[PDB]
Amino acid sequence: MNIFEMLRIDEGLRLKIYKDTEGYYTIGIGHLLTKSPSLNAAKSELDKAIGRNTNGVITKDEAEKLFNQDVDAAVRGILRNAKAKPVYDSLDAVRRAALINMVFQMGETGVAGFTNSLRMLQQKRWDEAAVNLAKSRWYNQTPNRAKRVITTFRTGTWDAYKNL
Ligand SMILES: [Cl-]
Ligand SMILES: [Cl-]
């Protein structure tokens, strides 16, 4: 298991524009296109990202390419974030993947409301952190996914992803 396989399980793979859990147009492996209600705007953003007139449809390779870019960006985003960096550097490899997954899903903006949880992770107080992470809109909206990531932070193993 690794970050790519982990997110592929959590986000799935769709080759046509679809609406995510929050109702935003997305494609591929969880690649958000825009928060705008406009399908046209979404198709436009898609063409801009792929470099061609797609007609709201892409190939598997194109999806994987977007994915590679998106993971790289999340990692780079963490490294540049003054609050997240110290946490990321303190964690072991498995746990780092869990932090990447959150950032990929909710962005630096979302991860920003997790100040207290991040501090517990940095302190290595695993059970406490798991409890705090669960008191969030994130957990109430996407509980199954949140449970998988939380278990990852709690245990430091990929157990929640084995079977999927
Ligand atoms: Cl892009
Ligand atoms: Cl879920």
UniProtKB/Swiss-Prot annotation:
| Annotated positions binding substrate | L32, F104, S117, N132
What is known to happen upon mutating E11Q?
A: Complete loss of activity
The record's section on InterPro entries has: Endolysin_T4_type, Glyco_hydro_24, Lysozyme-like_dom_sf, Lysozyme_dom_sf, Phage_lysozyme-like, T4-type_lysozyme
Q: Which UniProt keywords apply?
A: Antimicrobial, Bacteriolytic enzyme, Cytolysis, Glycosidase, Host cell lysis by virus, Host cytoplasm, Hydrolase, Viral release from host cell
Reported induction = Expressed late in the viral replication.
Signal sequence coordinates: none
Q: What is an example of a GO molecular function annotated in this UniProt entry?
A: lysozyme activity
Location of this chain's protein in the cell: Host cytoplasm
> Does DNA repair appear among the keywords?
no
What does UniProt list as catalytic?
A: E11 (proton donor/acceptor), D20 (proton donor/acceptor)
List the SUPFAM superfamilies.
Answer: Lysozyme-like
Q: How does activity depend on pH?
A: Optimum pH is 7.3.
Catalysed reactions listed for this entry: Hydrolysis of (1->4)-beta-linkages between N-acetylmuramic acid and N-acetyl-D-glucosamine residues in a peptidoglycan and between N-acetyl-D-glucosamine residues in chitodextrins
Q: Tell me one GO biological process term.
A: cell wall macromolecule catabolic process
Q: Which family does it belong to?
A: Belongs to the glycosyl hydrolase 24 family.
Q: What is this protein called?
A: Endolysin
The organism that produces this protein has a lineage beginning with:
Viruses, Duplodnaviria, Heunggongvirae, Uroviricota, Caudoviricetes
Coding gene?
E
